[PDB]
């Protein structure tokens, strides 16, 4: 029988059950993000933006919420020391509740994929067996990642639609969330330059879109398919982990 | 609490040797502008200079 | 083609190796690194 | 005809039918050890503080006196006793017997007798099972190490307080003070011991990987490969020729073990002889033979001292030496 | 010559003898 | 096949190794006895460890001008 | 392969030449292993022979200065260089090989080439195991010391101020590095190091006990007093009695192995797990996340001066290491620490 | 930390122990 | 026997049909060599900029880059 | 309160040792 | 392939593996309790 | 412009390509 | 009720956890790549 | 009893749930 450390090997050959367990893990991660944000807001003391900031209070995902734009809270305060007149729906608790309801919906989707696993979409019609066209799935995922990265780099960080990112003075005294102009020069590869992030995300998104379109268009070769075992799920698991 | 400036009897400005990252307990040394050790909190406190 | 005995070759090589190691050990008491 | 009481007792003692073989070595191994475990559990739980250095500064060492598992340790005997024998009857009261470190001597003596008779019992069961008897010869290396760190070093330094404390933080204290005294890192015997344990880990991984890699396919991928091995079988479970060929084209062809008997003998002999060497290194340090001393060895043409890595090790030894037993030295030279 | 065995032995044998000669020479270097 | 039992027992092997190995030994001897080792590897001689400007261990204390500063702090 | 014609090309010719029996197997990994490992070992042997340490550490670390095999080392670069890769074409060496040897770039050369040689050697075990059709448990085990090398020689100095606090390649320099973690980190007290010690000691015990058990539970197969000539490689029978071994260790120790595959897997598992735990501990120490003190015991000892333990003795000893080490261990700090402030006990 | 560590230790000594007991009894009751 | 037929499954059906349909020969592995070597060059460039082993006219590689 | 936790963990460990020694699965020898 | 799942597997954990798991958990707890309690 | 560090880096890339070609030539020369 | 010893930043905890997880996933990638290349011999050897 | 309640409630949950789970998987293992 299967040993205790081989239990998940039951879903190597099942794409529907694989999607179900991926959704279950993804729901667990989203629920943890929401629960952690609620816990940190519950134990958070905003009574000193200067001498007792969030990194002095051991806040983990609060800087990550802050860095991308979430600065106001539903508690009627702002981490910069101001007063939130109307934080809207995208506050710290708002993002946490959104993560919680996303976790619930993903749990329901995981249950549905666990039950309705036998979908002929997972079966190739040439032989009737269950198989996945991993190069084409990778092309779709790379194309989607390219669109998402380019949108994040051209609409969120640049501020034409989003709020921008956290920009400050070199000594970190003021600090705020501003839209940032992309630096297409060598200074854009300056690690401390905030303008590198929009330029990098725009260029990487465009190149990922092109690579995904190429992967959708062109099939692999005999030598590569038999060498890296592109028809195997442990190969893509190994490389994704890498 | 404000910046601490240390002075000896004849008026030279001594400064503390800031403890590096690797050390958790560091000997306290008040060393001058020229880099000569002028005062400390001596562990010996007998035949201490 | 097997003219010289392998045991004699090994004895000569081991003698040179032992004498060379003795030379190195003698060099630890004279010259540099000998505290003198 | 086996009716007399001593014949029946001898047959029961030498009986291989017991769950654990006792034997005539076990008739000493069992009571001495169970004495040592009993007093060791009791001391580790509720031992009052012990004046290890003889300077009337006691060390708690026990959990009920505020120690955790890492810091908990049976403290060595008082330095005033030294190498004197201190049983309970040689003390007027249990209070001073515990204050002076008597449990440490009792545990050390009973443990030495127990490991010696465990080695004898290993030989005895090898004899009564028709086996070759050198398993006890292999076990003579950890026994040598324990004797060197519990009895031989106290003998060489003149005090049981100088032995390894029965614990974890006490063990680290023993190692640190020992480095201060003897510079054990710079000793060839300790170097062979370190090479032996590192090579023992290497060879354990090598042999296990070679055998587990070369198991004959007798199961599927949904069941454990261990289920392919049936106990009591005579058929071989792995390809010795394939494993030897893999090792030969991995490292060297003519410098590889093509014989499993020689390979297993090498696996047996390497860490055992290296632990023998390091136990003898500790025992030679007990008589103050010490490691390599290279303090101020590299000197330039003008005679100025050129410091080396051995000089930095000397600085570490100084830092340990000026701090170990911070109140037990009334004089500069540490001859005790 | 010009074999893999020859090259593999020589790449670790020629510098070994050269360095052994150098270390033997510097044994006799006095202060 | 040359299982090392023929090459190590042949005078044909040993007539050319009776000159090459001693030649390499003499080359290694002269490489350090002529100061070439100190030249190419930058190791200081026993008489040049300390200069007149400094009587202690040198310190690099810089990164981007380390070449020029180690040239200044070396024994010329 | 796979009922295809598979027209021969230069790749197939190269694969055919690389995967051929010879003295030292090359393979594809030999295109990286042989130069990387050869240059790493040769660089270490050259640094231990000629290249000095007078400018990086102010120390003698080669045979040409008077150091022997134990005290010679390829020294780490200076802390002011930080984590610079110290290329010979970099901004520090700038093409000068002689000054590059004096700048400590040989350490970075040897370390990077040795890391890539470790990668190539484990790829070599992978490629040989695929050539002879064996499972790669050898390099699954060899993943452990590569992780140890990475965590110790790369991850730890990367987390610290620079390559200066990396281990210099040499015996006494490793001893200095070891005593440095004793004094500055209390690396013995770290539970991950505790698991590493347990793994190595258990692996050595397993190796010794398995060799002794096999060699002492052998079958006769004799007509000769030397058992080593009583073995035939081409056979399908066991030469040591597993049943007798199991009975002996069940009646001596209490438990015994009944599965040879599980026994050898355990002999694989113990050192790999121990070395990986030690690597995790060194990664923790890379950020000075030390298991240095027990806080409750510290407050108890501070509020009650009659409470002495071996742990407090170790704390005092580590303070002694840091104090009597810093001045001559870190020349960049310029710690001209006076005598009167150095901790010192009664007399001695 | 005096009792939060107690709770963490309790959870660590039960949850995988209970899980292992589930698997062990699930195998032991099947012949 | 066919599985559970769904409109979404029939819509995404041609996206997963050619399981095992590959190109003959080596395909675009020269393009593999070109792309992978340029990516290694770019990655090395990034590493040298961030390690300060390569200095440019416009980069600073410090917190005053925020200035 | 910590000492009782330590003593409980160690007596549980000795219990597992005694259990593994004396109530182990017998070898089947089949 | 059918209405029931064809990849129906039985998880096994024998008594010796139970011994190893219990010892692993208890020894890990003994080792890390002094650090968690601090 | 072309800094000295960038120029030395480009020459390093050229030298790496040269030594890779030399290794390939030594391999194909058997 | 602070104890008096210095603590670690969220940056430090992030880096420590991610480096430990990075080495663990290096091992995971090794194990899965070994299972990838050696999938046919995962149950043993061919013995032929 | 602020956290004595924690440890009491914890063990009161743990002991019967582990007991019931063990005997249940004993039942369910044999078909
Ligand atoms: C590129 C492809 C993007 C596809 C997803 C688009 C989702 C979206 O456009 O939806 C965007 C959503 C919701 O954003 C909404 O955005 C609205 C519009 O805000 C605007 O407010 C002002 C209106 O004048 C300014 O124009 C300002 O730039 C802009 O932010 C609201 O005001 C709120 O901010 C908010 O509810 O967020 C999100 O990014 C969700 C994105 C998930 C990934
Ligand atoms: C996203 C990465 C990833 C993925 C998808 C997989 C997937 C898989 N692994 Mg793998 N592995 C990974 C990473 C990953 N692994 C890493 C990083 C390591 C190094 C530690 C390993 C080491 C490893 C080994 C040694 C083995 C597998 C095996 C397997 C297969 C069966 C797993 C199973 O049922 O065990 C069951 C798991 C449990 C019963 C619980 C384990 C308890 C853990 C130790 C503590 C609980 C963790 C906690 C809940 C969450 C923390 C994780 C999070 C912070 C990331 C499966 C397909 C097995 C295999 O090869 O199949 C034949 C196997 O032998 N993996
Ligand atoms: C579209 C839905 C959505 C949205 C809008 C958000 C939004 C947010 N999430 Mg979130 N999350 C989601 C889904 C979503 N999440 C899901 C489904 C999960 C479960 C997996 C999570 C789990 C999660 C966690 C655990 C956390 C968040 C956090 C956050 C907040 C900060 C994000 C951050 O950390 O920045 C940065 C994000 C990154 C650095 C990700 C980098 C992606 C890498 C670089 C991709 C590279 C690989 C790629 C394939 C290569 C492409 C190749 C190219 C050529 C194309 C933010 C408000 C954080 C938080 O603060 O809690 C509230 C937090 O810790 N989320
Ligand atoms: C890698 C991700 C990550 C990181 C970087 C952090 C970082 C941080 N967390 Mg957090 N946390 C995480 C994941 C993470 N957390 C998750 C997944 C959870 C859900 C369980 C939590 C729940 C959580 C809470 C409730 C709290 C924090 C808090 C904190 C902050 C204080 C430091 C600390 O954690 O104590 C020290 C960390 C350690 C000592 C790590 C232990 C080292 C290893 C894991 C031990 C090895 C395991 C061992 C075998 C187990 C045996 C022990 C047994 C005997 C009991 C810190 C910045 C505290 C805070 O400041 O409030 C915001 C706080 O109260 N975290
Ligand atoms: C101990 C190291 C190690 C080992 C044994 C393996 C082993 C394996 N890897 Mg892997 N890999 C590694 C490290 C390692 N890798 C690292 C660090 C990465 C980056 C995260 C990768 C990324 C990776 C990917 C993406 C893939 C593999 C794959 C594989 C498998 C196929 C064989 C192969 O192509 O190997 C790998 C070959 C190498 C590691 C050689 C690379 C070395 C280059 C050529 C030298 C570069 C030097 C250059 C001058 C840079 C120096 C600059 C300086 C400043 C540092 C195999 C099981 C493939 C697979 O299918 O898995 C099943 C695959 O998909 N690996
Ligand atoms: C310090 C102890 C130690 C040493 C010296 C060592 C050495 C070795 N192990 C090997 C193998 C193994 N090691 C294994 C498990 C282990 N090995 C361990 C510990 C060690 N392993 C431990 C603890 C384990 C258990 C996890 C396995 C499983 C294998 C093998 O498969 C293999 C073998 O067949 O063994 C018989 C050999 C193949 C190395 C090689 O060619 O790489 C290529 C050469 C390189 C990379 C050049 C070295 C450059 C190094 C990394 C940096 C420079 C260092 C200088 C050259 C020397 C500095 C010396 C000072 C530090 C004193 C090599 C002799
Ligand atoms: C009051 C009291 C009690 C005070 C003491 C307090 C105290 C000191 C507490 C601490 C105690 C404690 C356990 C501390 C250790 C903590 C610690 C560091 C734990 C490490 C934990 C851990 C997971 C580490 C990871 C590394 C790891 C996996 C280690 C495993 C080590 C391990 C079990 C090794 C095996 C040891 C060993 C004895 C093997 C014997 C093997 C054996 C029986 C072989 C015989 C044999 C051989 C054959 O060849 C054949 C053929 C047969 C048939 C056969 O039989
Ligand atoms: C949490 C609270 C519960 C904790 C549970 C802890 C349990 C500890 C109980 C104390 C252990 C004492 C075991 C004594 C068993 C004697 C019976 C026997 O050995 O077989 C008889 C058996 C009888 O013959 P047979 O039944 O025909 O096989 O053989 C013998 O006569 C040998 C007698 C050996 C005597 C030595 C006693 C065992 C020493 C090792 C115990 C070490 C103490 C530490 C315990 C943990 C490590 C194991
Ligand atoms: C042990 C430990 C660890 C791990 C950890 C983890 C793994 C974590 C976690 C965690 C988690 C995992 C958490 C969580 C949470 C969750 C939640 C909180 C959830 C949710 C959900 C909900 C609530 C839903 C609801 C609903 C439904 C039901 C459906 C419909 C919709 C709705 C929404 C209504 C480590 C190793 C790291 C170390 C440290 C410690
Ligand atoms: C650095 C570098 C490089 C590289 C190099 C190389 C790679 C080489 C080499 C080299 C080498 C590789 C050397 C060596 C050395 C060695 C030696 C010096 C040896 C030894 C040994 C001994 C001395 C001992 C012996 C003995 C005896 C007699 C007794 C008993 C046994 C024994 C074995 C112990 C180049 C320039 C390219 C570039 C730049 C960088
Ligand atoms: C280890 C080994 C080996 C070997 C090595 C060697 C090299 C050895 C040697 C050795 C030798 C080379 C020896 C010699 C010797 C001599 C002798 C042993 C003698 C004698 C005698 C006597 C007793 C004397 C006397 C006298 C006197 C008293 C005085 C004067 C007169 C006379 C001289 C008469 C080999 C590698 C092969 C193989 C492996 C193992
Ligand atoms: O007791 Mn334990 O450690 Ca033999 O040295 Mn003298 O005494 Mn005391 O000092 Mn150093
Ligand atoms: Cl002490
Ligand atoms: Fe074996």
PDB file of C-alpha atoms and ligand atoms in Angstrom, chain D residues 52-53 79 153 157 159 161-162 177 181-182 321 324-325 328-329 334-336, chain G residues 348, ligand 12:
ATOM      1  CA  UNK D  52      31.781  21.590  41.624  1.00  0.00           C
ATOM      2  CA  UNK D  53      34.826  23.857  41.930  1.00  0.00           C
ATOM      3  CA  UNK D  79      37.023  19.510  43.693  1.00  0.00           C
ATOM      4  CA  UNK D 153      40.574  12.490  32.228  1.00  0.00           C
ATOM      5  CA  UNK D 157      43.876  15.900  36.026  1.00  0.00           C
ATOM      6  CA  UNK D 159      39.812  15.392  40.168  1.00  0.00           C
ATOM      7  CA  UNK D 161      35.174  17.474  38.962  1.00  0.00           C
ATOM      8  CA  UNK D 162      37.252  17.517  35.788  1.00  0.00           C
ATOM      9  CA  UNK D 177      37.322  24.307  28.928  1.00  0.00           C
ATOM     10  CA  UNK D 181      43.502  23.583  28.361  1.00  0.00           C
ATOM     11  CA  UNK D 182      44.787  21.319  25.613  1.00  0.00           C
ATOM     12  CA  UNK D 321      41.181  30.203  29.770  1.00  0.00           C
ATOM     13  CA  UNK D 324      36.879  29.125  32.915  1.00  0.00           C
ATOM     14  CA  UNK D 325      36.372  28.652  36.683  1.00  0.00           C
ATOM     15  CA  UNK D 328      38.861  28.873  41.493  1.00  0.00           C
ATOM     16  CA  UNK D 329      42.376  30.108  40.599  1.00  0.00           C
ATOM     17  CA  UNK D 334      47.031  26.485  35.652  1.00  0.00           C
ATOM     18  CA  UNK D 335      48.879  23.319  36.609  1.00  0.00           C
ATOM     19  CA  UNK D 336      45.919  21.552  38.239  1.00  0.00           C
TER      20      UNK D 336
ATOM     21  CA  UNK G 348      45.328  32.970  35.756  1.00  0.00           C
TER      22      UNK G 348
HETATM   23  O1  LIG O  12      38.982  22.067  37.702  1.00  0.00           O
HETATM   24 MN1  LIG O  12      38.137  21.764  35.819  1.00  0.00          MN
HETATM   25  O2  LIG O  12      39.831  22.895  34.543  1.00  0.00           O
HETATM   26 CA1  LIG O  12      41.746  20.877  35.035  1.00  0.00          CA
HETATM   27  O3  LIG O  12      43.046  22.836  34.619  1.00  0.00           O
HETATM   28 MN2  LIG O  12      43.204  23.409  36.506  1.00  0.00          MN
HETATM   29  O4  LIG O  12      41.681  22.136  37.171  1.00  0.00           O
HETATM   30 MN3  LIG O  12      40.316  23.399  36.829  1.00  0.00          MN
HETATM   31  O5  LIG O  12      41.595  24.628  35.894  1.00  0.00           O
HETATM   32 MN4  LIG O  12      42.010  24.240  34.194  1.00  0.00          MN
END
